[PDB]
């Protein structure tokens, strides 16, 4: 059965609620983004209206084969009426196609559902500037002060400089990048651009990328592995065995692998600055864990919420334990007492 934090009161609407069968009273199912924990349940057999972004709709049709008649893409930054209720989709700064949803309830209440997001000061100049929000359904993935990590731009600068130095010292090095979902495409795209190569990958991954409206993509990626010196592999292969096995398949073109594992936060962020990061190495294979986050840091979350000044907060992540719930509620009350709302 569908939990309360996925239901929007006073409406026929749910958000990211496809794993509970037919939800009683739901006339429109919203999908914030194409990540498996959120889309769980959708298929060619789904026969209710799905509301989402253009990019999410391309993924639903080509990867899950949802029929075209049930996919309802909405443009961003545009007031739209759905089943008699005004809604707006906003960019969530998460993965491609990911949105926040603003709902303007018939009784005068305004609700913001962040989906998954990485808060940014630029959100302070969206359509959110114009009015009050009574309820905030908040992505609380990293809602504790220990969760620190650098900007995406600093992490990409590190990756580019690391890859360009290695391959300039050894023109026979191959670069490998791990993936297991959409998001974080800048990691492999920026490295391939500095190196003058296309990114090589499986047919399945190429298909996924072709759904994402990335400008000039045909110039950036390929399924011809032999033409490419930046390869994508599933994340589970980014270890010394998997990489050894990969290097064998490359027909003596290469004599070294430099590999990247984009992660979220890890506990080595408590001690080591991005500049000072070192790899794990065995022989001619080196593996960098790089903390490229598509979720808000604690400080970015706190900034956004103290700017928005919501009347009530409903967390959507870390909701399963009394200790997690109690900790989040303590931070929400500090933020409110500090800022005065
Ligand atoms: Ni996500």
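Q: What amino acid sequence fits the structure above?
A:
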């Amino acid at each position: 059965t569908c939990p309360f934090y996925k239901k929007i009161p006073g409406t026929g609407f749910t958000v990211d609620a496809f794993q509970y069968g037919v939800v009683e009273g739901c006339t429109a199912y919203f999908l914030t983004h194409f990540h498996s924990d959120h889309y769980a349940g959708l298929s060619k057999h789904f026969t209710f209206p799905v509301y989402c972004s253009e990019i999410t709709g391309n993924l639903l049709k080509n990867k899950l084969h949802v029929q075209e008649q049930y996919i309802h893409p909405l443009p961003l930054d545009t007031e739209c009426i759905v089943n008699g209720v005004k809604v707006v989709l906003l960019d969530a700064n998460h993965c491609p196609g990911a949105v926040m949803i603003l709902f303007y309830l018939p009784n005068g209440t305004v609700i913001l559902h962040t989906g998954d997001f990485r808060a940014d000061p630029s959100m302070e100049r969206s359509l959110l500037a114009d009015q009050k929000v009574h309820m905030l359904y908040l992505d609380t993935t990293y809602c504790s002060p220990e969760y620190t990590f650098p900007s995406q731009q600093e992490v990409i600068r590190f990756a580019i400089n690391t890859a360009f130095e290695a391959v300039t010292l050894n023109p026979h090095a191959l670069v490998v990048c791990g993936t297991y979902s959409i998001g974080k495409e800048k990691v492999f795209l920026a490295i391939a651009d500095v190196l003058g190569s296309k990114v090589g990958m499986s047919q399945e991954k190429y298909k996924t990328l072709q759904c994402l409206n990335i400008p000039e993509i045909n110039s950036l990626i390929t399924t011809d592995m032999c033409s490419s010196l930046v390869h994508l592999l599933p994340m589970m292969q980014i270890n010394f065995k998997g990489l050894q096995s990969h290097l064998k398949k490359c027909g003596g073109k290469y004599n070294q692998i430099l590999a990247f594992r984009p992660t979220g936060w890890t506990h080595s962020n408590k001690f080591t600055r991005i500049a000072d990061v070192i790899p794990q190495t065995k022989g001619n294979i080196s593996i960098y864990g790089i903390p490229y986050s598509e979720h808000s840091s604690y400080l970015e979350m706190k900034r956004f919420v103290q700017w928005l000044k919501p009347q009530k907060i409903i967390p959507t992540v870390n909701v399963g334990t009394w200790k997690s719930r109690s900790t989040m509620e303590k931070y929400f009350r500090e933020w409110k007492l500090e800022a005065g709302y």
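Q: And what stands out in the fold?
A: The pocket of nickel (II) ion is lined by residues 33, 35, 94, 116 (CB under 6 Å).
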